[PDB]
Structure 1
């Protein structure tokens, strides 16, 4: 689907990377969601249930959906567009080192914010400063660009 048809989105952290403490991973995901909820009518609530809209997984190689990861670097993560089942879900390649990004590894916060954009129905942007641009680059500044917000408002108002 192009967009979620309800506004109260739920998410389930199915498993964890050992790269970071669980509370840090939880917080990284919460911050990524808060980025999008500030600019949409959507809310994001954590649940402990397989019936969540956005199921979050860490995995390596072929991890059950026919879109395999590739070891260290290269592919970082992927997410399915809105809809039932696997649709909406977000998977992170645990052959990466997940971190807060400033030093070694990839920022789990930034990559999750990008993936959650796909999970809400956004495609890749052509603006290099936008969050939805198809290349990772670490930044400590505001991730959202006009294009990201215009993209998400087009879907959600």
Structure 2
């Protein structure tokens, strides 16, 4: 089924704030903003956590686009392979989600990886959700373009376990 992190990592307050560090030129500013807002929105319904967009570094979740070597000492691999990573809830790097810009970012439709869709799985990690044995889950290691809506019992059971 589903998994959580050692020690059951979670945000210990209910207002979660995200600051978007930068953008890909792949998408217009507005599409990217929307794609992310939607990804929290899927998580918003099922959790006590609310997500407010902020314009400060002090934010709980910081989203950035990086190529190869970037901030956290974890390098991306270029085209394909790794597309994004995230860290379980906590201070600094924890709760933060990074997307590899070498990847083509789109709303999918066979043109690339859906920014919303990659974001949800990273956002799931950001809330403390680990990977799932269930092959239909959002937290599954395998990405496919939507047979969505994205959310699943396994993923939702996973989130209910941690927060509500």
CA–CA separation in structure 2 for the residues paired with 1:89 and 1:141 = 24
CA–CA separation in structure 2 for the residues paired with 1:140 and 1:49 = 35
1:44 to partner: Cα distance: 0.3
CA–CA separation in structure 2 for the residues paired with 1:48 and 1:64 = 19
Report the counterpart of residue 134 of structure 2 in structure 1: 127
Structure 2 alignment gaps of length 5 or more: 1-7
CA–CA separation in structure 2 for the residues paired with 1:126 and 1:76 = 20
1:141 to partner: Cα distance: 2.1
CA–CA separation in structure 2 for the residues paired with 1:140 and 1:16 = 27
Detail structure 1 runs of 4+ shifted over 3 Å in the superposition.
Answer: none
TM-score calculated relative to the size of structure 2: 0.94
Report the counterpart of residue 71 of structure 1 in structure 2: 78
CA–CA separation in structure 2 for the residues paired with 1:104 and 1:72 = 14
Higher relative contact order (CA 8 A, sep 6+): 2
CA RMSD of aligned residues (A): 0.9
Instruction: Give deviations 1:20-65, integer Å, cap 9, x for gaps.
Output: 0000000000000000001011100000000000000001001021
TM-score calculated relative to the size of structure 1: 0.98
Kindly tell me the number of residue pairs found equivalent between the two proteins: 157
CA–CA separation in structure 2 for the residues paired with 1:52 and 1:147 = 28
Seen in structure 2, the aligned counterparts of structure 1 residues 111 and 29 have a Cα distance that, compared at 3 Å, is same
Report the counterpart of residue 161 of structure 2 in structure 1: 154
CA–CA separation in structure 2 for the residues paired with 1:34 and 1:56 = 16
Report the counterpart of residue 59 of structure 1 in structure 2: 66
CA–CA separation in structure 2 for the residues paired with 1:71 and 1:54 = 24
1:140 to partner: Cα distance: 4.6
CA–CA separation in structure 2 for the residues paired with 1:76 and 1:141 = 20
Corresponding position: 1:89 with 2:67: no
Structure 1 alignment gaps of length 5 or more: none
